TrEMBL record, chain B:
Domain of life, per lineage: Bacteria
Keyword Transcription regulation applies: yes
GO biological process: regulation of DNA-templated transcription
GO molecular function (one): metal ion binding
Residues of the full protein shown: 145 to 392 of 394
Protein name: Probable two-component response regulator
Chain residues that bind Mg(2+): D66, D181, D215
Amino acid sequence: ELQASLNLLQEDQNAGRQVQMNMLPVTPWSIEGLEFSHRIIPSLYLSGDFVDYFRVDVAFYLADVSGHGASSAFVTVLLKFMTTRLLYEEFKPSEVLAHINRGLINTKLGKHVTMLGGVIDLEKNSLTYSIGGHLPLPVLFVEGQGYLEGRGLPVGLFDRVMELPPSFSLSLFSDGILKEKEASLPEQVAAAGLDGLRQVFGLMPDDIALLVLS
Amino acid sequence: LQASLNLLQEDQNAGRQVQMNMLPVTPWSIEGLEFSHRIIPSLYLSGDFVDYFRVDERRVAFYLADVSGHGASSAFVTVLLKFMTTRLLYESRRFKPSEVLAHINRGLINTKLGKHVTMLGGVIDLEKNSLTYSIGGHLPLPVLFVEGQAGYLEGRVGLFDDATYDDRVMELPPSLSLFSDGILDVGATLKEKEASLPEQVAAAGGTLDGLRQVDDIALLVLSRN
């Protein structure tokens, strides 16, 4: 048998999956013609990948935590907490990646987080984004059109501004396959493929999460 | 990765051990104050957490936190706690103790899993032999062991947005213990009886945490002599 000691863990794992469920924003949430929407596919129960976008007065990001499981799930919580703390207590995300850096630098769990920061200023149709990871760069424009330029040497352990078209379509991705060949493929598949274009792309062990803006 | 269950247990262990390096070591003593604890998880990870940090040697902080229920969901909340406190440390260029329960309250109040935590805050000053403690829960009051005697300190979470926090100051003779909603682990079946039993058992028991070594159950004991 031995199912008991398992079913209990799965019932415990689910309690953590669902606690992350109410933690992420809903989709597809749109504001002033901007459809913020995402798709996260956890490793069955708990995912270290998290995505959250809120309107300051618009911020957004995609975070991929090292490895997977309970340990990785804990880190995402901190992230969701720190960002909402800055809200209660304008700027550039490069300064926000440093704030998150300090949280992780204390190395409470000794976990480094790779994220894709971004803030769109409805005023002046400008998007300022910072990246601190080796994950697949942002892609925009879908069929009409590519990878956004930016140095992601920064990481959780231890600023590019761009105008925004009317219907341009930007997608942030987790470290999900689906080396150099594989990094050239997804940009093309994204073009070939928004949420329904990414799901077909999706159609594994490590968590799979993607955030699309449009 | 194997047997599905075994994989979960290997995953659960990764979370248990990640909380291991998160808690302070024991029995850590400073200026004749032995800060030490004993946490016993139920399902690998635990909602019960204990952390005590020195503060320039002038003052010493400490607390015991019991999170609602148990499991992974509860384990997440403890993380926040450990984070918020260490944030105040870096950010405080230095009043009350209960002021910290409110800070933690705001973290949890603002769309954070809708989890309420019952804690026993406390800050002692090594020089003035005084301990100021605030409590915000209906968990088992602190028991202090002095000359083979025991008693609960008087004092009255954060889900409500109202602070409603009261802090009691009390001088300290020449051994304080915090207990979780966990009981009858080592009488049973009565509420008031069971609240009167532990103080007595604590007294009967070796005052030291050494004895202790011999829903989540976690206890923190302090000792001086």
